[model samples]
Target: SLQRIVRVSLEHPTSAVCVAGVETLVDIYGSVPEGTEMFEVYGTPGVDIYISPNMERGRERADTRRWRFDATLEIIVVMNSPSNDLNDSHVQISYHSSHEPLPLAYAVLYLTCVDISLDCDLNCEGRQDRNFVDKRQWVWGPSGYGGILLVNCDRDLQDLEDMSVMVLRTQGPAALFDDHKLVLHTSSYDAKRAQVFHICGPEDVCEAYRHVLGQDKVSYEVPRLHGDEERFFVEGLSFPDAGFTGLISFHVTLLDDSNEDFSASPIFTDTVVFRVAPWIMTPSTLPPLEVYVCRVRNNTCFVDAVAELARKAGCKLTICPWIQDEMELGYVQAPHKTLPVVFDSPRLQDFPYKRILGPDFGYVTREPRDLDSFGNLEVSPPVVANGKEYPLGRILIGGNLPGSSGRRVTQVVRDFLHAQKVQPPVELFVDWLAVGHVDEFLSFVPAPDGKGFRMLLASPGACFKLFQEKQKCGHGRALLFQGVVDDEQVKTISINQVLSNKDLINYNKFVQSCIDWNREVLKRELGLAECDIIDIPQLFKTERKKATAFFPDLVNMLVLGKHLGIPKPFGPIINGCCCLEEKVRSLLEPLGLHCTFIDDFAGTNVCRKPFSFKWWNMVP
Candidate 1:
């Protein structure tokens, strides 16, 4: 018996065919159906498809007779394949059959299945190599109404666009632990009234008329933003009391452009706490105090200046004369009392000195062994609370050590205060200054409110302001020189050089550093806030590419009771000294303070005077 070979062909001559819907009988199955098997199925250029025949149910049959005929198979050509690109094209599916039927059985075979497994390549280096930077800091200070909070984010302002900042407050234990407690109440202060009451200047005398009587129309100017938008100043924040002791929390959240909340989590948050003393006395409760001065021959003019102010304020003036031992030991050489030692009093006194005004007002002597030139100290009168007077301790700059010594002195000062049952003294840092005395840059005057006292600090910024104003007023260039040399006959040589650009930059840096240090010590150690500070303009001279010279220190003036005695400006005769007087008066007189200008007896000649040699004796 010979086997017959069957051949099957697709109706579409080409292996590829367009799809159709009309029904057609392609083939009939034999006793053992040898179905057509697809080899390759292709639609688009980049698409590939494979198909397998279902032959598991096929069984071979042994028949006596066999007839072979050509089988025309119409697949409806429904070919599907994954598309590679956008183009119009038909599908091509090729298949081969093992057996063929003749007009056979009017069979219909349909082939319409596409199997494609896609493998895609993706590049993710952009996301995997991203870079992020962080720069955040907190800035705050006491304001007229309460406090101002400024959040400095070093990113672009666009990052904060559509963002919300909230200040929250809490009390008791919750203030320390709870985050979502109470929202801070917002309030505004009468800026005009505050300016009138708080700001001290020449125009303040007419404040009532400016704001009320229509003597002059009051001009209202809105506060403007400073620096950049990256630094956000949170407004409308007010404390319950002037000296509030509590915790304030700040939270920042991102929002949509429509001002709707967009983020479920806060972007940033911070908190600040205020701690104040309980037994603090108001400036009004302060009693009449005495003014103590050192008796130096050269400083007699300065002493007389303060003595006049003391008389005007009804304050007793006591002069501490040069002790015999101090004079003999060459420690009391100069008349400048600030040099040798300040506040040097005897622990045990046996001998009495000149009594110009009796025990209530007289000169007292101290033991020679108790003399220490570097140990200058000044103590505040005992604070009266509940009918008890409490000594407020002292204020002085400590030793001249660089690093650890400075810290050790500070600790020692604190320990001494603790042993004496008094408040810790305001230990100022004056090592960088030529005049190593706290009085040169710091002062304590009674607050206008009579509660505690306001600390007056040297403000280099104010000095720079005056310098600018002087130039604007057509002051000649000679007034801005560095050094002045005068001969024995009064003929002089001078260095008439205006500050250079480099000089201004260095000056600004120095001023800022001084301000930063003062603020830190006042807040961290002395328990004083920004509101309790008053900055007075005091100018200093800098040598050409060298050290700073100390002179024209209006802040170093004597404070006699409620009256303040400031030395008249002595550098250059600009506008017959009226400009200088107006400048000083503008900052002080408006604060309801009585300021008297004391003539400088030594004049500008003191600029050339060398620092007292006695300073070296005390520099242990």
Candidate 2:
């Protein structure tokens, strides 16, 4: 007779979604010995094996490792391992005192156990499923794919930045998945600017709900997963400032405590990416909702002039008690919420955060070596050029152009503004000025024409021509800067002397060349025609090859709708009127603008609004 061990086959799921303290049944079938059959069983240590007639009975005696079997009995399989990684084990059953007690068989059955998978809204379609798409890479658009992140610049709630919703999805046995921990992590670059938060318990519960992840605690244990999904919220703590790429990615990794084979590696990981929303600037054309001006020391008249302008424009005038410095105001918007976000320059002592940071009013800044004064920051009126519309307008910042010897705006600030995809920034050369601010030579004013506004640029050639014209007309002795000559004891320059200075003309020629270069950039980048720009007569004197305003710069005027508060240039007086003022009025008056020349003789920084003024369309 042939000696035989039982050949076994299984009526089972082939695999089980394992859970602790739970039971599964695999029906075992094979040749067996005669009646009164009894069997002994062996299996993987964490798992339990036993034979029973039904699932209910199997559940009751799940861990009964040794038992009798007729070969067709159900083997209850219970996996104790918490790991999501697959596990394989053998069920060894041997004949134990059967009726025949023949030289017969043992039965071997195979079982597989698995935990769960982790997921997020990779498609950004507001639903999570096992798509099998590459979660590591990013794409965009309807046909294209990716996750979008918005900078939490607006207030989502009390003292909190705006937040984006992130969902973590789990699929498989709940208990087994819960046993293994999930880790939320970000790269060094991403974590530098933002924080991930886990929302737990109920919305009404405060203490349990708001919790920060990583940096404080590395792994999340027993994340309260009600069914398959858990909610996570992300908030941006920093803007995409200079040298910062707005793209940030987040990963949720399933951790295996056993870490099989002593190899430290993630079993399963899911990832999604986000981008920071750009900070946008409002141009002068927008009617002011609120006007802000920092009080400069010993310049009450300049502060009063700004206050007067705000009063007439029917907007609130906010006076910062501090001196003229950082705390430039800009604003950011989403579909519903908006706030007046202040953009601070790198130069600060007391810091405006003390005043500007509060509820509804958001504040952002970057600290690096280079000086990027907010006066160098500005924006244009909404424009539609080359079939692409910039309804929020394009951001204009002053810096040396690409590859120039002059210093560029620090990478942090530039990176932040550029990362905000909405308003693409255009860089212009304003490094020629001693102050190195664009406000020294350029501004924008509202126009009645269809264009909404016209660009105002300083014109050294126009200033030289005006001086020459007056000198030729026998007003050669007409004086400029006469008001300050008596106090400073510096002799005033006349139209004749100014026109005769060949070296001075050459100095402005260099100034004009630099302005011309930016003029081209503005015209090309902004898509402007010659008719869209106006040349304002202004002069600059240079030392060490850096230009300073010759007399209170006129182009650096405060624009409040149609009313303009121009600095008194105090040029050669012709017919009892400052000829420079007459020249400016003749240019702007036909467009229905009012010119009010304010006397700001002492503050060489005639542009009192160095904290560049802008408006925000606020929500009530």
Candidate 3:
């Protein structure tokens, strides 16, 4: 009787209403008919239920399936989070009896106070899984981004499990495809060798790769299954000699197929575009250069050291002594030659010849004078431009002359280039430097990769590293200021004094700004990426407001073809020098360049008194 009553009630619901909350409990009482077997109660599709069946005392069914008793059924409905949209749906309770063929009961419930939809929100996390080209691991190679997306379901799906599929699309200066293939091309060049792309997603889902070129679409089944991290990767994407260079757009998407039917909606999507432009100049085809140095007193050691290096590299070395000698003789010399003149090419014929003063005294000459006539030279500056090669340009400090500014120097250089009908040389300004010469701060040399050139800039940070290393090695202060000339007449300071200066904080900031400005200018003018520029660790000393390099001036290094000659480290023992030598090699050897350490300690012992005065007078 009790089972019959329970079955009858479940067949037709007595009461039903949508319940909203975390959980709700209900009880039902019924009397089954005689010869009742068993009964079962449960919730339908969308609802989760826990049931308890209660029987009267001494009311039990025999093995023969005969039962006559009163029964009570208790049910609990567990709801999802209040932010979920399941409140709009129905909750059903069902009961089954074994006595009758198909006798059952069911109750339908509806949620009444459902809230309105809110704004759609999406949050995502992205990363680089791996990068490679032709199976070779590229540390700084072309790479792309991959990630997972977390979407809020208040406005759409009811929960995270509701998301079945995701599609990502990108729009930019690159090309993309609907089938999740991305193609990138170097700007107007087929220089890009190879590349690899990968995307990962949730478990129990499938992934496919597709490539589209114009109207033709191709598919590659390079799908990797999800692992312990719930992630996958697509590898071995190639960019071989396709004879095409342009834009390639890439995209990725995720789909859910945990159910019988694969979900059509995408749960996440992302896109990226890449541009390829490789450097044009190869190492063997690099433009040749001529070495130039100021012919100043106490600088013969430096000049001679550089000349030896230049000879080894088969390059010309010119000593600029006329400007200094003429200025000392009170001859009213024109602008400083090494600090003002920049050649359009390695040849003197391409020099920007501008007479600074009147023709009476002939303060400056633009007659394309031979290098042999200007100074005692072992080899003369090249007289003619090489075939189809970029000209070797020079960097000069601006505002070194009276009533002249760096701005004016730039204008004059541009004017000369316009007059000569040649491309602007890679001329740079070192106005912030006391030496008023580019050699004091930066230089450019042929890259070892045979791809254009690499810029070497003075890095005070590198100098600091050497200082710390020396201190740790117990070499103390002597190694830092070795060969330094800090006399009363010519106060050539040491790195320690420079670092200890009260204004060092502000000075360092200023130095960083100057470095950044030069880097940006070089990148724009030379069309160089940041990776093309290299830093040479060098320390500088300040005498009053003038800055001169310390013992080993790497920036003021002598670049002779493929050979780089740097000043020997300052110290009493070979051990200290060896320490510095190792550091320098670590920086240079990677670029496939050879290093030669010259044993001229006096080369770096420079004073800023004469150099800074000429520029300081015009500053005010």
Candidate 4:
């Protein structure tokens, strides 16, 4: 084969065509079928075309194309070199298609994924870092007459419009949101018909009405009350549309608005402050009943002075006025039109010492006196003014008397029979309505010995009626008769009696309904009844806060805790807890239930005892 180096070159120039229409030749084997030996042919390569003279059936030898040109036979050979690195031999091919690449598509895709991830991360961080600032904050504000701080927002809040104003109480310093030392008060701005309300510290308290005033507006008007000595009024703002359900919130801000550096600026958060009136009476003390003699008219100075003195002395005083006819029938001479004489008699044995308050201011000792034939006192005056010893018989001063001249009459007679020898406790009577007239007639009467001083007129019954009527209308100094139901026979009764009276079944029904509603609310909240005793230590444990917060409904449940007779936990925390407990118990105790507490797993070392219906001193 080497003797003649035949320069084999295929003369068929196959127009460098890519293969096409080879669909039917899928099973064709080789360019040189069976066996053929020839020289190398160099041209465009077609299906299975090899530049080899030795071509066999599916053999792995070099192929020289059989020049049996049906159209034009073509063949070509390619060689690959070995490389140390696999990537060094790699070739990357980029294909250009009909569609053009877009730059905005990639950008939008990237931003969309990033935004989603960022949003998720921000939400998670917000929840972790925000604390409960959004949910709760400090609230400091004034109610109608007092200030308050409240921990709970849901229960303690009220509408702003109809509520009272929360005012600032401190001079320069005010409440800051972060300040926790000052406790909160819970009350209403309006107590409807309440007569009395309390005033608490002004340190951080601000009137609810202050919201209306801008920084520039300073002046305000408030209604004046009893206390005029002190600068008793403060400026306040008003909220026009605030309704009954509106509540007040207070916070502190910088006095100057332009300051940019607010590092030291006060930040007061919102809190629920309640507005409530002061209680009229304490649960322990009882007011006493008193009696007095009252005049019908002309008793202004004397009545006022006596009432003032009695009030100062802490005495419950009353006034009773008597009619002239009633006085004559009761104590004076039966047949006398005008009062004949006066006396003090403690016992029936001795005669009374008589003192005349009109004409001549003098006294006489009526020795062992008895009624005369016409129901008259036979007077013998051993003591007389100016030594004019006239016959000391029954002296008549008015009307057609038996034996008296009207020309010399300068005084009428008023006989108080209680003044016997032992200075009978004088049931003194004076015409207060005619106080001016009585004062003129009694110009000669001696000055009263501070204790024995009596007014010219008295009207006890009228004063009593006034007090009662004012209380009924809810405008008295003390709200003594409020919240009390009226009965047919007894117009009004005591609150305690109305609650506890066994005879009044209807009262029992009403009270029971109220109690049941309260207890039911408690039960639904606390998941416990009045009888269940909770563990004190567990309540004070760290886990307690979480548990309580989880069950917001139970805010009212702790009310019955005291009713159950559990000694409230000790210390300052216990004080507030006990107070709240007392409020709940006060509301529930009137109903019938025996509640108590237990201690320890073994149920021993229980300090406090049980509460029962019969136990008057129980923890209800």
Best by lDDT: 2
- Which model, 2 or 3, shows the larger lDDT? 2
| Candidate 4 per-residue C-alpha lDDT over 122-229 given as tens digits, one digit per residue, 9 for 90 to 100 | 111222343223222222111111122111111002222122333332211122112211222212342221111123324245452233223332222222221211
Badly placed stretches (over 4 Å) of model 3 are 1-307, 315-413, 425-429, 469-478, 483-506, 568-574, 599-620
Question: Which candidate order results from sorting by lDDT in descending order?
Answer: 2, 3, 1, 4
Kindly report which residue stretches of model 1 are placed more than 4 angstroms away from their true locations once superposed.
1-294, 297-300, 318-397, 401-416, 450-452, 476-498, 501-508, 542-550, 571-574, 601-620
TM-score, candidate 1, is: 0.39
lDDT of 3: 0.37
CA displacement after TM-score superposition, residue 137 of candidate 4 (Å): 9.9
| TM-score of candidate 4 on Cα atoms, chains taken together | 0.15
Candidate achieving the largest TM-score: 2
Report lDDT (Cα) of residue 268, candidate 3.
Answer: 30
lDDT of each: 0.35, 0.64, 0.37, 0.21
Across residues 1-620, which tens digit of lDDT does each residue of candidate 1 receive? 11111122444221111112212112222331245432223344322222212233322211112223223322222223422222233343333344543322222222322121111111112322211211121111111011222111101012121112222211112111122211111112221111111111232243322221011312222111221111121211111122222123222222112223543322112222111111111121133344445446777677777667767877666665333212110011111121111111332533333242133211212222112332233333323333333343233433354553333233332333333222335555555555455555666676565335766777766655666666666663535212224425433211123333456546645854765685676555554567767777665545543224333567766554457777665544464454555666676666566778775422110001112221112211
- Model 2's C-alpha root-mean-square deviation from the true structure amounts to 11.6
With candidate 1 superimposed using the best TM-score fit, by how many Å does residue 586's alpha carbon deviate from the native? 0.9
TM-score of 2: 0.64
- In terms of TM-score, which candidate is stronger, 1 or 3? 1
Candidate 4: count the clashes: 70
